[PDB]
Amino acid sequence: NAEFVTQLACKYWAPHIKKKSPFDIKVIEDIYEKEIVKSRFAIRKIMLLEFSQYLENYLWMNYSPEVSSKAYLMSICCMVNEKFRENVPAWEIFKKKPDHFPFFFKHILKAALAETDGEFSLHEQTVLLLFLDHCFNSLEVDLIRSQVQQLISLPMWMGLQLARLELELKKTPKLRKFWNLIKKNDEKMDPEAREQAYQERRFLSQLIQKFISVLKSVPLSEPVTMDKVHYCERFIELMIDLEALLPTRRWFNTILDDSHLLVHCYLSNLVRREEDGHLFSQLLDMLKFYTGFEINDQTGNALTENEMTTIHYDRITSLQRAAFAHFPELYDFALSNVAEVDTRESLVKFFGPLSSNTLHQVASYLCLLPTLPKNEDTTFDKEFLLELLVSRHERRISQIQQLNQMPLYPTEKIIWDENIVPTEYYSGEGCLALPKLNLQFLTLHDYLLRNFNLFRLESTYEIRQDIEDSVSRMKPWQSEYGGVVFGGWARMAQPIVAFTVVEVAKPNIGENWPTRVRADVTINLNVRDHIKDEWEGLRKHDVCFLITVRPTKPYGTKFDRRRPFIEQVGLVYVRGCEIQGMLDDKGRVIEPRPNLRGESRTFRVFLDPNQYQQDMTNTIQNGAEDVYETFNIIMRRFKAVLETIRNLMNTDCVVPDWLHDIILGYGDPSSAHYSKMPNQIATLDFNDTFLSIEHLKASFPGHNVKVTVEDPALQIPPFRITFPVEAKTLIVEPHVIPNRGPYPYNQPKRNTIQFTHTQIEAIRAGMQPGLTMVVGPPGTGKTDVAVQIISNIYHNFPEQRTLIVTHSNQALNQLFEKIMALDIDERHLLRLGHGEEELETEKDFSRYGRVNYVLARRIELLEEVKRLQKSLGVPGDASYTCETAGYFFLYQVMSRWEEYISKVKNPDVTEVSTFFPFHEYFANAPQPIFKGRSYEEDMEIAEGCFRHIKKIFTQLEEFRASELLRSGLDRSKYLLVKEAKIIAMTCTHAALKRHDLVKLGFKYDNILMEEAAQILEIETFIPLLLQNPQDGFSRLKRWIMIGDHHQLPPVIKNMAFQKYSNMEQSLFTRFVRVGVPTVDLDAQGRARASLCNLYNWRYKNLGNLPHVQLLPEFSTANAGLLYDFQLINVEDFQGVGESEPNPYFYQNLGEAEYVVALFMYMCLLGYPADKISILTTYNGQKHLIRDIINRRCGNNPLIGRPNKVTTVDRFQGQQNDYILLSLVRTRAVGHLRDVRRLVVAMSRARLGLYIFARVSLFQNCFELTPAFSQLTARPLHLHIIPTEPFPTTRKNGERPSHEVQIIKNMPQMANFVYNMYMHLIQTTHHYHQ
């Protein structure tokens, strides 16, 4: 029905048509019947409608109260569900139309409340339950919040059993007065008003009744409908959403305890059918967990051991009282203890032989149920009553210890399931048993539990997708004795002949996980020459994966690509493995390879810290078998994360008191900045940000500058800039950086970048206590302002730690490059990492490099010591080390400077030069500095050389630590603990070695982070435990993070983990959705204005720098191209647009040959071949691109190799002068829906972009309408200057004096380029080869 759906869209509501047809309820109902009812809510139907924008163009903009009907409601709900699946903003039509939003919520609630299986079919009931779950979980929206306000308010508890409400008001005397206020306020109400209020209050109870009756309407064994099960599971999902949301639970949990969904759920047969209701009962276990989760109903705070124990014992005490007063048989049960009545075992030995009316009257006395009339039989069974009473007054576990005993590795019952860890073939029509990490958790343990669940699901994807990799060209076949056998040959899969343990060393101190866990996998590559060569070319930190399978499909079974490949292959265990190299004749991994004779290669790998500790803990506590031993294959192309999360979860979790609320998402999101952190620096040292006083006053556009000294010629200092706290005065006070002696080469390094007012204010909010998120859009100098803030924090802080954390190596190396010209001592920088690190920075800030430089610097300090002493005229032939050097300062330099000080400050310019005995110590320096002209300045110079000798003595003092640390890594630990003023690390390294530094010198005073968006929620929440609290408070004072919600996020292991739990929602993204302040710099200087326009309109007032506005080269003409941004149409070539020659390996050979001809045109036109970037729509597209490149160009003496022939996600952190983009996608929108990947692929060309794609198929996206307007803003052809070599002096706006080329086909463009190549081959020749 794609034809009729697209036709209805293009006639009535599809964009890109001058005329739109009027609205029609008949048309809406007809299309609805022809798609959704006829196709059972087809994903392709709702997806063609989502490409057509059926909601934002037909449903809500033309819906109405007299027009809202079954078809419109169902279509809107299905569209919103499909948008929730496809991960695009959905509720835009609702936020546009608040007029119809309460009516829409009322109609959806009416459908969800009315009879099941009636008019609204069971599919519609699943749709309504899913819509209710989504509209509850998106509660931060205005209209949905207002809809659920009166429906989930405190008067929602007005429908629970009257005795239960009475006992609730008796336990909480504060709630009785609120209910009295509600009862008095409902007096002046209308019939419809108060009736709708009561219906809203009891809608939750009515939906719980409908779901429970839908479950109970299933027989024990006789097959049932899975759609009713989906309805009940979506009801459980809405219940779990309102159990994870704090105020959604505040009233819902009372009716939860009233109706006891747990007892009926765990008593029904749908949970007893391990096939029909399995994942439903699993979500039911998680639901009972959230229902008994220790988060107090009154406060939203967790319960203590005493609190929960008192609650349980008081339930057992009320049971004892009700037994004494109303139960003759339970006399021992009354007079029994808490330890003797609280446990289900003994409690059942007492109340299992109880009778029906006995337990029913017991529940009446405990106000659990409506009382049983005299001698009558409550229709609830003995099983129901006993289950209820046991679940109420039985023993329950501490969640802390329950999660503590957990195995961090997936077992043979978990690793191959898509129910708690869906695979890479996800569809999106259902949910999986995953947590949520979007806005707010109930407790810190709850947040950590969801984090560890997502981590275990990602590790389960890494263990599930590649476990079915045993010989996997043709689904490996069985052998005799059930053995494995490779009856075929695969390229990226090969039979690993064996796998052996080599190195499982000790863990880090205190921790529970070894640091290097290495295993060598051996494979006898009797295979093709070139394929076995690509298999033998193993590199350093190269990724491989060992596959182990438990096959049962015997020899010859063919594949069914539709079915689970996991269940087709019967896999066992997949272990990722980072092979340090293959073995040689000397058994040592390949660190030129030596002459390998034979075919068998063994590669020794260690993928993670707790690599051989996850399966270890498994075979330790959970009785599972060995995963590193049943290995069968090696295949090429998070346990330590879980153990660090467990360290935190069992750690006292004492965070900053102004960061608990931010990491909780509840509370005032604007509290954690400088404006609400109460200890901001009064007169602070922002020395680095300003270079001139006029420029400082210009970077203060909203401040009234109180300049301490009017004199214009004396004022450009590191001036003290105080913000007030009369009310807008920026106090600018002059200072002078103290002298350093005679050496002008000791000029204290000042920064030379003119960071604008927004960057200055961002650094100020970073170095004023609290935390801050500096939105650094592409090109705003994010790392520059970060290093400048670290510099200002080194100006305001002599002893504190500046813990630089980054998400990748790029940010860390850029931070080193910017600290290269900052006035920092090289004995104050330390760095952590993930193994062997290629230091891309100028001077090695690495461990051994800094320790050797430290030895050399202490040698230099000893040289200065000997020079000063010999100058003072000592006796001696022997040498003194750094300890005796500190003693030498104290003994001689103290005495000399003390004579001089108590002489001169107790006084003329002549005494300034006379009373300094440091002439022979300055005998190697510029001419005598104390000029005798001004006594104060002469003493400044002399005492500056004195304090230069003092700083030398202090270098030697800090170097006695290197004299005391015999070992290299020991000096590394010591100098990273004590003298390290700035410690730079990555997130994975920080989380893998957190306890290492924690016990080896952890101090966190201010943390500055770069690439805050590429660290995960958990991968950033982990460094929140980089230390412990300090005598009752965490030492964490400040946190300046540079981030951007509009850039590419972490690309997860499986698309299903983020499809299920939105793993793409970083902490900064949740902070943006909350409303935390975003110090959004807007001064970019890397790409032109008109070319950056493809990425500036994506941010908040994203602007440019004077460099961007005035650049003589960024306003220049492109080499053989008149348009700075072209994404031209790429028609079908030879009948091929985008094709998938391999499963989903998307490529488009038409656009690909166009792009190869384009790179050839840049080559033979002189645009430098190293300025040639091939960014694509798919890695398979880039692969086919490189194929066509080396097939048509090859090793041409006229054409070099592109700079980056890479992926949209794999080209981050970089820019380009001219990017060739191959945007294959035309039939499906793909994952371009992400604003992240959109802005990425749009902001990767600083001067020119040339793309081949489908123009209408691109503009068919609602998310990318402001993108398409400026993407197709030019003609869709190759509009260039063909005969124009690299230098053509014209600008972007000038008139050219030559002929312009307009190519419309890739054959013809390549033919032009080929005639050009023949012309140049006949008219010239190169020789470099």
């Binding site: 007079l335 330890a339 003797e340 003693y887 104290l890 004579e899 108590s902």
Partner: protein, 244 residues
């Protein structure tokens, strides 16, 4: 009356580095600590990170313990407790036992919150191993400043489990007697568990008498328990005694 003379005089007396000027530099910090602990902490810290001696931190901490700044005294004590090149700084002379004495005078009946006290006991027991003496002391404190519920139960259990000598049984007997109604299942079965205490000639009656005189109602169990805790050799009228 002015710090100028103090600073300049100290610097001029420090021109040489003999044992001269020492008791003029440090008592200067002593007399400066009056109404201003900042110069006292300054001289203390800079001295512990200044001219070498094992008596440096000694005089520093011994001057700081006498003032209203005592965590600085403990900081110089910690400088000694690491010391980086001499675990034993002074031979027979004591720094760790003296730190334990100061921790005792801090856990003196001022901080009776009953957490800092047991923390200081574990801190002294960590700084130096305690052969049953501070063990009995801390076990008695942990049995007295606990409650009566499973808290006191675990207190007595862990104390007896890691105990070193007797009268720990008497400590847990006091606990069990005070808590003789802590559950409505046994009424503090620790009473019977301690009536079943050590076999030959230790107490054999103490916990039983405590349980039978919690105040007094009727033991009905302590007789059998004490008479099951190791009578004479097997074959005798001991069976008839257990039968009566």
């Amino acid at each position: 009356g002015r710090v100028t003379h103090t600073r300049r005089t100290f610097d001029r007396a420090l021109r040489a580095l003999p044992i001269t000027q020492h008791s003029r530099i440090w008592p200067l910090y002593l007399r400066f600590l009056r109404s201003h602990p900042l110069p006292e902490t300054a001289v203390r810290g800079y001295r512990r990170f200044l001219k070498l001696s094992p008596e440096s931190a000694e005089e520093y901490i011994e001057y700081l313990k006498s003032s209203d700044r005592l965590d600085e005294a403990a900081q110089r004590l910690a400088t000694v407790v690491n010391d980086e090149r001499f675990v034993s700084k002074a031979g027979k002379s004591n720094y760790q036992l003296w730190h334990e004495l100061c921790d005792l005078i801090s856990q003196n009946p001022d901080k009776v919150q009953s957490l800092n006290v047991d923390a200081i006991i574990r801190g002294g027991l960590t700084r130096f191993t305690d052969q049953l003496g501070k063990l009995w002391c801390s076990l008695a404190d942990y049995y007295i400043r606990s409650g009566h519920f499973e808290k006191a139960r675990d207190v007595y259990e862990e104390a007896i489990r890691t105990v070193m000598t007797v009268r720990d049984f008497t400590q847990v007997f006091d606990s069990y007697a005070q808590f003789e109604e802590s559950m409505i299942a046994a009424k503090m079965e620790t009473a019977s568990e301690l009536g079943r205490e050590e076999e030959d000639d230790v107490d054999l009656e103490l916990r039983l008498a405590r349980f039978e005189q919690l105040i007094s109602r009727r033991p009905l169990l302590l007789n059998s328990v004490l008479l099951r805790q190791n009578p004479h050799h097997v074959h005798e009228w001991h069976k008839r005694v257990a039968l009566h």
